[PDB]
Paper text:
Our data show that this locus orchestrates the degradation of 1,6-β-glucan, and this enables B. thetaiotaomicron to utilize this fungal polysaccharide. The critical enzyme encoded by the PUL is BT3312, an endo-1,6-β-glucanase that is displayed on the bacterial surface, allowing direct access to the intact glycan. The enzyme showed no activity on 1,3-β-glucan, 1,4-β-glucan, or 1,6-β-galactan but was active on the 1,6-β-glucan pustulan, producing a range of oligosaccharides in the initial phases of the degradative process. The crystal structure of the endo-1,6-β-glucanase shows that substrate recognition is mediated by shape complementarity of the substrate-binding cleft and the hooked U-shaped conformation of 1,6-β-glucan, rather than through extensive hydrogen-bonding interactions with the polysaccharide.
Thus, to explore the mechanism of catalysis and substrate binding of an endo-1,6-β-glucanase, the crystal structure of BT3312 was determined in complex with the ligand β-glucosyl-1,6-deoxynojirimycin (GlcDNJ). In the ligand complex, unambiguous electron density corresponding to GlcDNJ was evident. The structure of BT3312 bound to GlcDNJ reveals details of the active site and the distal substrate-binding subsites. The Glc at the −2 subsite adopts a relaxed chair (4C1) conformation, whereas DNJ bound in the −1 subsite, the active site, is distorted and adopts a 4E envelope conformation. Within the −1 subsite, the carboxylate of Glu339 and Nδ2 of Asn237 make polar contacts with O2. Binding of GlcDNJ in the active site is also mediated through apolar contacts between the sugar ring and Trp377, which provides the hydrophobic platform in the −1 subsite. The catalytic nucleophile, Glu339, is 3.2 Å from the anomeric carbon of DNJ and is thus in an appropriate position to mount a nucleophilic attack on the anomeric carbon. Glu238 is in an optimal position (3.4 Å) to donate a proton to the glycosidic oxygen appended to C1 and thus is able to function as the acid-base catalyst. The −2 subsite makes only apolar interactions with the Glc in GlcDNJ. Trp345 stacks against the pyranose ring, whereas the disulfide formed by Cys393 and Cys396 also makes apolar contacts with the −2 Glc.
Author numbering: 37 to 60, 69 to 494
Write the structure that this text describes.
């Protein structure tokens, strides 16, 4: 028909099911434009790659096509990877574990896992955006703290030695360049994953003052001098700033220093603490700066495998909730973990599930979890370059939505009906109209031509 539809229900009566209706209230107002959208997706971790590589090649490629193809799938369009290890790598490591930045090289995990998978994904989707972050700097760039500047031989904790700001900037540059030599353009970085976390299996503490100085004196100058167009997003942690008074408004503080801010596209957030309302505060205070949602997880702590508990809440808070608070993109954590929540690392998340889970006896049977749905419901109809546009018509209980216009002149609409009852909706673009009974506890995505 005229309007293409995707539906998933909490109960799995519909499972990204396809429908269509023809033309025959929520009214889209394309003259009222908000942010443009970069993409949506998941993390391609070492553990994700390991699981994918253990599948039969054709099954892996089918899954990757379904996930990442625009024409043959859901068109996931943003992925996140780690610079060096994360807690879903096959070891603790960095790309320069031997002291001296002259020792920089991509390691076995990149050569054997990350690069082969990303090359397969790029074969399917050559315009996919990649954002990266380190979980730790090389251990030898660490100090115990900024007031105790002695070495710290730890994959976790510590702060970046100010004497190594210039060499660590060089680290980022060599990494980006090595990926480029392999055929992969890095679209964006952050300076550190979750810089207020000292825990995990790999970490580095970095306050806003350190990040400001690192960006303005080393990372921003060096990336620009290398001719890289890679964007830099600040922060990359939770809405509450982990309840550390000094660290509140983390990116805002950095934006106030004009020398740092000139290198920053915006700020990145996760939702592991605090309330997504924070995104609105930051946008209002600095409308010139971008916002991107870069990590959330499902796991044993939030019944991650029970879609009846997760679909509605995750679509409301992670997907539509961030996009309606100015975020240009939404990226979840591990695309694929096995049914044992792995492979994982001692001290890292050992309670996490994947956006999908794969069975580790056959490496074939895959179960989609809430994260796969929330993203596919976005990426299936909202393509890169889409601009979020206003809606008018009546505020209804349990109903949330978002509307966009894609650069190909197609409108896209995504709607959550968090009510047991179906609801009859009617949708207008001003010239054309369509109606659809939206099932209870559903997400529905719609796309049609202007
Ligand atoms: O807070 C919920 C749980 O999060 C688990 O961490 C998951 C991911 N979160 C942030 C980090 O950037 C990732 O490396 C990490 O895998 C955490 O392990 C668990 O203790 C929490 O209960």
């Amino acid at each position: 028909g005229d309007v293409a539809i995707y539906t998933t229900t909490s109960s799995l009566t519909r499972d990204l099911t396809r429908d269509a209706v023809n033309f025959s209230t929520i009214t889209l107002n394309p003259a009222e434009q908000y942010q443009t959208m970069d993409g949506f997706g998941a993390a391609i971790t070492g553990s994700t790659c390991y699981n994918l590589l253990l599948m039969k090649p054709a099954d892996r490629h089918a899954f990757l096509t379904e996930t990442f193809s625009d024409k043959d799938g859901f068109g996931f369009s943003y992925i996140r990877i780690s610079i060096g290890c994360s807690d879903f790598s096959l070891s603790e490591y960095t790309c320069c574990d031997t002291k001296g930045i002259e020792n920089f090289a991509l390691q076995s995990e990149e050569k054997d896992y990350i690069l082969p998978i990303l090359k397969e994904i790029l074969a399917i989707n050559p315009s996919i955006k990649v954002i990266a972050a380190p979980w730790t700097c090389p251990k030898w760039m660490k100090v115990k703290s900024l007031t105790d500047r002695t070495p710290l031989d730890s994959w976790t904790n510590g702060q970046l030695n100010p004497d190594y700001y210039q060499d660590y900037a060089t680290y980022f540059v060599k990494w980006i360049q090595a990926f480029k030599a392999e055929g992969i353009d890095i679209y964006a970085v952050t300076p550190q994953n979750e810089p207020l976390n000292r825990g995990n299996s790999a970490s580095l503490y970095m306050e806003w003052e350190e990040q400001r100085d690192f960006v303005k004196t080393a990372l921003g100058p060096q990336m620009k001098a290398a001719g890289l167009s890679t964007k830099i997003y600040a922060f990359d942690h939770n809405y509450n700033y982990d309840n550390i008074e000094s660290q509140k408004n983390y990116p805002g503080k950095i934006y106030e220093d004009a020398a740092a801010s000139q290198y920053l596209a915006g700020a990145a957030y996760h939702n592991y603490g605090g309330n997504r309302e924070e995104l609105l505060n930051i946008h209002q205070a600095y409308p010139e700066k971008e916002l991107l949602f870069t990590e959330t997880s499902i796991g044993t702590w939030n019944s991650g495998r029970d879609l009846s508990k997760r679909l509605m809440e995750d679509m409301e808070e992670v997907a539509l909730g961030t996009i309606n608070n100015w975020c240009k993109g939404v990226i979840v954590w591990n695309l694929m973990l096995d049914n044992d929540r792995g492979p994982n690392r001692e001290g890292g998340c050992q309670t996490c599930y994947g956006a999908v889970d794969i069975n580790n006896s056959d490496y074939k049977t895959i179960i989609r979890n809430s994260h796969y749905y929330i993203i596919a419901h976005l990426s299936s109809v909202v393509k890169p370059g889409a601009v979020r546009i206003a809606t008018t018509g009546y505020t209804d209980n349990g109903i949330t939505c978002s509307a966009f216009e894609n650069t190909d002149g197609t409108y896209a609409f995504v709607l959550i009906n968090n009510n047991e009852k179906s609801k009859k909706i009617t949708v207008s673009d001003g010239q054309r109209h369509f109606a659809y009974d939206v099932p209870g506890k559903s997400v529905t995505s719609y796309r049609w031509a202007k």
